[PDB]
From a paper:
The APOBEC3 family of enzymes (A3A-A3H) forms part of the innate immune response against viruses and transposons. The normally antiviral enzyme APOBEC3A is an endogenous mutagen in human cancer. Its single-stranded DNA C-to-U editing activity results in multiple mutagenic outcomes including signature single-base substitution mutations (isolated and clustered), DNA breakage, and larger-scale chromosomal aberrations. Here, we use X-ray crystallography to determine high-resolution structures of wildtype A3A/hairpin-inhibited complexes and demonstrate the underlying mechanism of inhibition.
Here we reveal the structural basis of competitive inhibition of wildtype APOBEC3A by hairpin DNA bearing 2′-deoxy-5-fluorozebularine in place of the cytidine in the TC substrate motif that is part of a 3-nucleotide loop. The hydroxyl group at C4 is coordinated to the Zn2+ center and is derived from the water/hydroxide ion bound to the Zn2+ in the substrate-free state. Tetrahedral coordination at the Zn2+ is completed by His70, Cys101, and Cys106. The catalytic glutamic acid residue, Glu72, which functions as a general acid/base, hydrogen bonds to C4-OH and N3-H of hydrated FdZ. The 5-fluoro group of FdZ is accommodated comfortably, abutting Tyr130. These results with wildtype A3A, together with prior work indicating hydration of dZ and its derivatives in structures with CDA and A3G, combine to demonstrate a universal mechanism of target nucleobase engagement, deamination, and inhibition.
Author numbering: 10 to 48, 51 to 62, 67 to 196
Amino acid sequence: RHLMDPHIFTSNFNNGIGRHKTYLCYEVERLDNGTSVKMHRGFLHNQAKNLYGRHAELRFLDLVPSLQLDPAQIYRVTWFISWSPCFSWGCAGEVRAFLQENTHVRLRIFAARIYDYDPLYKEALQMLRDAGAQVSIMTYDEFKHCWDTFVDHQGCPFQPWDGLDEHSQALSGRLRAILQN
DNA sequence: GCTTGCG
Ligand SMILES: [Zn+2]
């Protein structure tokens, strides 16, 4: 019930426009068979770097204790993040360590955009996959699902930006190439 | 303001 500003959303999750900020919307569903259904769904951004900072993914790992997940149970955690996790600042590694430590959890990452500023972004994406995280590019369905679930839309159905699907394809192309090796 | 924080 803590919802995101529509302009905030559209200007950060646009897969054709980079921003100097990162948003991470998350869900936690529990599975006691196949019945995940829907259940713990908030969102957050990074602590800006002011001379270091704390990347959005670490802040997620920060708040895991507060979710009070039952370690006997198995959960799917879903992220929709405006930038692909980095490697260099230790995010991919920290997440791997978290998945090893918390084997009850099944992680699913959709990214709006690929953070290729990090020269080691490919290593980050492959390492996450190897750790058993599903690593994916947001398509229209996932942009819509965050709009529907996280955004203070006030009954307005999502209006996709020009070139959403061209960019979504382009990036899905690059990402699959990367996970092939 | 222009935006993969900076000036
Ligand atoms: Zn990071």
